[PDB]
């Protein structure tokens, strides 16, 4: 419109209306010129690429991308607490994106005639990098100004070399809207139907579903021998009931497992060797091994043991200001998934036992351990929990088949997720950057809780009494911090 006319206002708030929530977040960003306006091919060969597992080939692009994919973007710690204490489930409905108050600079003075190239890929023709849990997300704290991350992608390879089936994508070859300092951009995206995230912890366990007061009418084999001695064989059958629960016939069994190695938090308990990569469970694809992380959703540890965690089984966030390499465990924040302990196997334990032979007069009954177990009819399981720091959605890879598309790092899997938003400054050149404002608005449908539980629930609350810094607030230096990772599961349901 004009140099002196504003193209938008500052909208941040959250509206709680009936069965829905509407969250709105506005941030201030800065976009540098990347790659000196060039496409630059990248490979492991540039950085030296010593190993086969790490061998990659791809391209780096001058463009940036907006990433709002994490929850702390859209929810204040109070709104998160409001949401998790009162509700059994939630899910995104609508999306409203806006880009306004653009300012392009030259290197520093205002260059009023420049444009900004922005577009969204709504047909999903470009590689989708927003589901890999990268950085560049809008700051948790509204005051903070952030830098837009550089866009880039990978394609097929053999080692460092490319192949014929590889692809190349020109982000200039797309249609895009070119905005000046007076133009603004907006669009609205409607989420596809997805299940409500289950923000609750079961009040029953999968093996306790029985009535403790009654006997079953099914019988089991109690005794195979009358006593000690020769030729003592017998068949004795008893009733399954309150006195022996383990043997009762059950309608449902816990979910699948792929076992993890358990590392103790007390370092002296751990073996004196390097097992971080050698001992880690992994999956190989086309000859390259890859760590299984976080893996299938499984309880982090057995009850009563809080010091053990799966080797790559749970998400691990950083504390504010944590270094990149070889930080101590008190720097990282490891999440315990133990709320799914009711329906899911422990990640570090065998699923169960199976008979390995045919018993006979000579042969004893012999059983092995089941380290990994796939889906069986009659399994019921819980998905991994979502966190205030965690991802929201992921893109379902386009494929002939999949099972339970929910992404393994948590969140809402989508065939057509919120689209990518690409931005760069229009181009020897003038050294030039830009800044502006962004507002994202998501509608959230809520599932109310009608539990008839008599006693009070467990809630998320701030425990401390007197402390130097209130949690989830700035310090003396003005640095915002998130003290702990907060789960979504407090309220309970019957299994």
């Amino acid at each position, epitope marked *: 419109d004009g140099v002196g006319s504003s193209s938008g206002n500052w909208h941040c708030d959250s509206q709680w209306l009936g069965d829905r929530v509407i969250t709105t977040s506005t941030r201030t960003w800065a976009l540098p010129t990347y790659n000196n306006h060039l496409y630059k091919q990248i490979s492991n060969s540039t950085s030296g690429g010593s190993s086969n597992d790490n061998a990659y080939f791809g391209y780096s692009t001058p463009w940036g991308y907006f990433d709002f994919n994490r929850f702390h973007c859209h929810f204040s710690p109070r709104d998160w607490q409001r949401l998790i204490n009162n509700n059994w489930g939630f899910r995104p409905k609508r999306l409203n994106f806006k880009l306004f108050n653009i300012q392009v600079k030259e290197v520093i003075a205002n260059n009023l005639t420049s444009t900004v190239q922005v577009f969204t890929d709504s047909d999903y023709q470009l590689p989708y990098v927003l589901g890999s849990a990268h950085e560049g997300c809008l700051p948790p704290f509204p005051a903070d100004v952030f830098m837009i991350p550089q866009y880039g992608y990978l394609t097929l390879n053999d080692g460092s070399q490319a192949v014929g089936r590889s692809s190349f994508y020109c982000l200039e070859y797309f249609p895009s809207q070119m905005l000046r300092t007076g133009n603004n951009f907006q669009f609205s995206y409607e989420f596809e139907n997805v299940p409500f995230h289950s923000s609750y912890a079961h009040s029953q366990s999968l093996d306790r579903l029985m009535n403790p007061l009654i006997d079953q009418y099914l019988y089991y084999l109690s005794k195979t021998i009358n006593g000690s001695g020769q030729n003592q064989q017998t068949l004795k059958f008893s009733v399954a009931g309150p006195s022996n629960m383990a043997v009762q016939g059950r309608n449902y069994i816990p979910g699948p497992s792929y076992r993890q190695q358990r590392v103790s938090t007390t370092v002296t308990q751990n073996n004196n060797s390097e097992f971080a990569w050698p001992g880690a469970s992994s999956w190989a694809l086309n000859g390259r091994n890859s760590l299984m992380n976080p893996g299938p959703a499984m309880a982090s540890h057995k009850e009563g043991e809080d*010091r053990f965690f799966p080797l790559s089984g749970s998400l691990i966030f950083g504390k504010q200001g944590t270094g990149r390499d070889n930080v101590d465990a008190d720097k990282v924040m490891i999440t315990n998934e133990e709320e799914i302990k009711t329906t899911n196997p422990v990640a570090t334990e065998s699923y169960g036992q199976v008979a390995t032979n045919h018993q006979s007069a000579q042969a004893q009954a012999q059983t092995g351990w089941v380290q990994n177990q796939g889906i069986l009819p009659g399994m019921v399981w819980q998905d991994r929990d979502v966190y205030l720091q965690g991802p929201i959605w992921a893109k379902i890879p386009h494929t002939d088949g999949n099972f339970h598309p929910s992404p393994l790092m948590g969140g809402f899997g989508m065939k057509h997720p919120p689209p990518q938003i690409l931005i760069k400054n229009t181009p020897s050149f003038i050294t030039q950057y830009s800044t502006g404002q962004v507002s994202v608005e998501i509608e959230w449908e809520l599932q109310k809780e009608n539990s008839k539980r008599w006693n009070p629930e467990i809630q998320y609350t701030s*425990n401390y009494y007197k402390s130097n810094n209130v949690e989830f607030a700035v310090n003396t230096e003005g640095v915002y911090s998130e003290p702990r990772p907060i789960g979504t599961r407090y309220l309970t349901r019957n299994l």
Partner: antibody
Amino acid sequence: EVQLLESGGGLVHPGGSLRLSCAASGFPFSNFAMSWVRQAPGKGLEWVSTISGSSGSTYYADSVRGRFTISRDYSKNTVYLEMNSLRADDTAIYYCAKDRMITFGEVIVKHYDAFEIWGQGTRVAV
Amino acid sequence: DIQMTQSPSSLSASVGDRVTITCRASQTISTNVNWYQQKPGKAPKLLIYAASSLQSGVPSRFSGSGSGTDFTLTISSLQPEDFATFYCQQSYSAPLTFGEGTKV
């Protein structure tokens, strides 16, 4: 489980200062009172200090009072027992004990009952 | 300040046969007394609280009794695991007080 790691260690010169820490894990930190019990070489074990779960009430032993100071950090789930102007008889191995009684803020009650879960302890030589 | 005095200072006994230790408090402290045991090189362990109540991990062969001034710690079926210095504690009022102890 319930786990208490105290290390202040130390060998200090009389009149010097020392700060014991006890890192508590596995229980609700705020709802239990934490205390320090002391045992000299070849002697009986002697109560030193205790602190309320909310840290509103700190109780010191008569010999200790005015010198040692007990406090708890809610961020690190750690209880501190800083001691200054130490004396010869302060030589002993100090223990960190969780209280049996669970409390909350909505009732005025004594915060000490019995020491349910102890800790291996550290040595203070002076 | 309240004083706990534990009457046997040291003791030795045959295994399996009953042993009893008592301590007498300086005032009526009702049911506040507690009992502990400490083996050499090991941290103490809580046995009895609120005069007679036994801790979840303590064997049923331990028991305790009394109110006001007098309290007794009775051990039936003494065992080799049971030989350690024993203490009684007041929970009644601060500053808290441990008895002198009894080496068994």
